[PDB]
Amino acid sequence: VGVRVVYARMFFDRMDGRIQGYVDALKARSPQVELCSIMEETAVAKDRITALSDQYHGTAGGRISVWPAPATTTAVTVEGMRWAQAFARDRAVMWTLHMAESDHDERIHGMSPAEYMECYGLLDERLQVAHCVYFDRKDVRLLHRHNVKVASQVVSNAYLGSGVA
Amino acid sequence: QTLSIQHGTLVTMDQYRRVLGDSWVHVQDGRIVALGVHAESVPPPADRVIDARGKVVLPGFINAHTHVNQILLRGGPSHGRQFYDWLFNVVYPGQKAMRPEDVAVAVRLYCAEAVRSGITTINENADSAIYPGNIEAAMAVYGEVGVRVVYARMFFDRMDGRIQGYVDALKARSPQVELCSIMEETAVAKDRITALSDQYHGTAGGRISVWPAPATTTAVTVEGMRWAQAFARDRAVMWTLHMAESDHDERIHGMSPAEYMECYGLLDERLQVAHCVYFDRKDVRLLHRHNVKVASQVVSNAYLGSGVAPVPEMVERGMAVGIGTDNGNSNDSVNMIGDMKFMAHIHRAVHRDADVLTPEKILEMATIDGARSLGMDHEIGSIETGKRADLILLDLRHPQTTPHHHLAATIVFQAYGNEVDTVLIDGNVVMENRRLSFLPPERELAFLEEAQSRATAILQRANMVANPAWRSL
Amino acid sequence: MQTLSIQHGTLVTMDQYRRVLGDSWVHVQDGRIVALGVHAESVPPPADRVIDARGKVVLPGFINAHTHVNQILLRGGPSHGRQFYDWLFNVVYPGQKAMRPEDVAVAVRLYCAEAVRSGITTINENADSAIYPGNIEAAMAVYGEVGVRVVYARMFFDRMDGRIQGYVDALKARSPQVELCSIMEETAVAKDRITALSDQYHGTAGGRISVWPAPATTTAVTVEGMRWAQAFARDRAVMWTLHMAESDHDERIHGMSPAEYMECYGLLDERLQVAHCVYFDRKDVRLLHRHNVKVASQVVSNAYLGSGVAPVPEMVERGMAVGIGTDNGNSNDSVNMIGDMKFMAHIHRAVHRDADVLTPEKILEMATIDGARSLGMDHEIGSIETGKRADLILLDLRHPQTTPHHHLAATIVFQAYGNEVDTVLIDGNVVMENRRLSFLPPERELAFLEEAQSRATAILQRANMVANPAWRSL
Ligand SMILES: [Fe+3]
Ligand SMILES: [Fe+3]
């Protein structure tokens, strides 16, 4: 096609046991539709993403890139996010993460996702966060301090009834 | 022995709030035995006369809730952190790294600053009493120094499994600093505190007291709190508890801490609660109903980013609300006058009301009301016959306190905290013309260098960053 | 050609890289900082005098971004417990009116004594009493003698706000024996008087004194008056300043915010310094930001008068130049930069429920380099850099309250009381040394304070103001 593409390969290496009951209820809305899991072991994800990068990064005349994309702060281990952060740094690319897209997400371990990331040194200039709806003054400040990049999905935030970033 | 304080302006904080120009106080065997006006009466003869000419005499300030040892952790390591972040990455590890000889220095440093700022009574909430030799080291210094001390021995007998993941995350901020636990079995705590009380309660000429201090409603069992409540009753003292200091400390078992305590019959007139930031109208009502005493740590509540307690609401209901400086390292000063000023302003600002708390009232919080909040208002907090001679002399002959007409206003809105000149505790001269009896000027600089050095070493031992990199945002 | 060397200090430069230089020295000549160095790497030049700063911390002099001096004689009982307009009309105006020039001279010396003691080297005097004859002359003589750096922002009012009359009459009934005063003046009269004042005093006392026009507020000044001030500032390469939205009775001029109104008339520019931003919304901040408007935040005073809490963190996070002002000597009621810095740090942490909303470093910047920026003077003052003026202070942290100390900004903001300043240089001149004031020596201090006390008492008698109200707990 000839389009310029960043292929941000998403991964999930952690079960969020807190919201299963809520998901089972949601599934009952369409019970004939199957409940799916795309979880994978941390090491398997690393391997798969590294392989993908080695194979496709820089291809199609420089038009294609590959980044690691830990899905969210609740669906990914600290080890997984640290890996992605290191990977972005070592290969001069970015890493990206979905952050606080619903009200069921906006606490992880008694703090905001941005706060939690700050605790583990996970906010840096090579991070691009997506979905900043459930953000407070402090979260903004943290992202600003570390020069975090942002992608706002304004229409979608509306479509899904999340709100306004 | 006898002491006569003469030609002062007496700000009594007595029943009628008398302010007595050119007047005198007669002190004997640690008690205020008489007062008079110089124009109407002649002071009794006395062993010693202190000339207070052109000076203001107050009851000694009362620090309703504080933590002393932590003072060695101020100066860089302690700021910028929410309550639990501060607690687990700074306070616990730092305290753990402290040796008894370090504690002795901390206490003397704290007292030096406190007395300098007019503070005569201290409610020490002691979280490091669990470590061997610490109590003995501290008590020796409190005794020597001559300050009036409530030693509130804190205990924790219950794990709060609910906040584990939060804490682990917080610890990752300083992963080189140890995660510490000072938990102890209920019976062990009872024994240790009872022993401590038996040994030290009433010592240093009645100047030292001991109370039980269940840490919080989430870190202490019902059995533990009931024991403390009963203990206070049986021994005619108080018990104290930290209540709702962060939004994670908010709801215990689906209700507020005050609600939870009410359920178990744990709110009574001998309870002094500290930290009332996360309080609602109902919580206030409950505390009011049972005549619970309060200590407000207004500066610290700000320092740690907790928020602003409903002090005016409590005060307007006649509740006994004292002022506490809180930790030496969540303030980061031990200066009642600076904290009074802050109490006055923060509440004016938030309520958008320039008269929400009169300076008179703020001054009452620091003195007579504070005494009340410690259950000690029969013994201290005012210049009245029969009460202990805990007294302070202020000199307003400085630029910042000029002019002065209304004394409360001048003290609250103008004074910096360096205007206290002479301090008497239990009739003993503990400071005179800013010269400290327990830390003479020829020894002062060397002592501060020792405190600096030990502090630095404590931080090395605890693996704590003393001086973080310049940071504007 | 005369010279001064400050040695063996820790230099907190507030320079471009925020350098903190241990065991280092500063060379001063002809009022300017001419060099700096580290003792281990270099030898200080010879100098006429050496000041040993061993074991001491060297900072740029604090900058009081917005204050009112003369009112200091009205502190001590008469001034507290009142909302802005109550305070203004029952205390400030009548009290100021009752002041004679000899009274003003004492006020200014007392103010300066306290200020210099607390490390303040530059003062933005918003002068509301310049309309009374002899006052300017008396004040300027003292500012000059004392050696402080002064911006004299001559306030004017050329417009009656008829909307607020009934409110004021009701307020006056609180103290009906005190006179209702007006300091209004015709637009052209104000222009003439300010222009004369500028011509006469701008640049005097060895460059230490400046003059700015100061239209009081958007409701008390005509558009023509504000435009004039704006043009004046531009033409004479100075600033103009305006009090903006300090009470909820101000918050709406002609159906919009003061900032909105000013925007409509092209009255927001980079030479404007606004004071008091309590009643600000997002949009107001945005407007100020767009035009690079400078700000002075009077955090303590906003509390004292029960106005509220300004959105300082919001403005600072946008890189705006926000300085700290102590405001009135009688709406604080101290002249103590260190105490006010502490308050700035805490009030905003508390309200935002955020322990790190403003770093102590940032607070310290507000008091120094950022404050200089907010006065349009950051090329001359606010940091320890070669080429800038030698406005410098020495702090001794060898006291109980500032022990221990590791991180200097944290220590100063969270621990220091304001009495730790030792030596103060302004424009290279030694104005205070070991707490001994050059313009108020210790053998003369107590007598002077007794004079200030007396005069204050007398001023209140003349104005028929209650000095010491009855004890009141509720
Ligand atoms: Fe506490
Ligand atoms: Fe002002």
Numbering used by the authors:
A (entry chain A): 146 to 310
B (entry chain C): 2 to 474
C (entry chain D): 1 to 474
Text taken from the publication that reported this structure:
Two full hexamers (over 600 kDa) were found in the asymmetric unit of the crystal structure in space group P22121, whereas a single hexamer was found in space group P212121. The two structures are essentially identical (r.m.s.d. of 0.3 Å), with the higher resolution data giving greater clarity in amino-acid positions and having significantly more water molecules added to the model. The hexamer was confirmed by DLS and size-exclusion chromatography (SEC), consistent with previous reports for the solution state of the protein. The substrate-binding pocket and catalytic centre of each monomer is accessible via a long hydrophobic channel. Although the conformations of the metal-coordinating side chains found in the active site are indicative of an octahedral complex (as would be expected for Fe2+ binding), the geometry is distorted from that predicted by gas-phase electronic structure calculations.
Atrazine chlorohydrolase (AtzA) was discovered and purified in the early 1990s from soil that had been exposed to the widely used herbicide atrazine. It was subsequently found that this enzyme catalyzes the first and necessary step in the breakdown of atrazine by the soil organism Pseudomonas sp. strain ADP. While AtzA is a hexamer that contains one essential Fe2+ per monomer, TrzN (which is ∼25% identical to AtzA) is a dimer that has a single Zn2+ bound in each active site. Although it has taken 20 years, a crystal structure of the full hexameric form of AtzA has now been obtained.
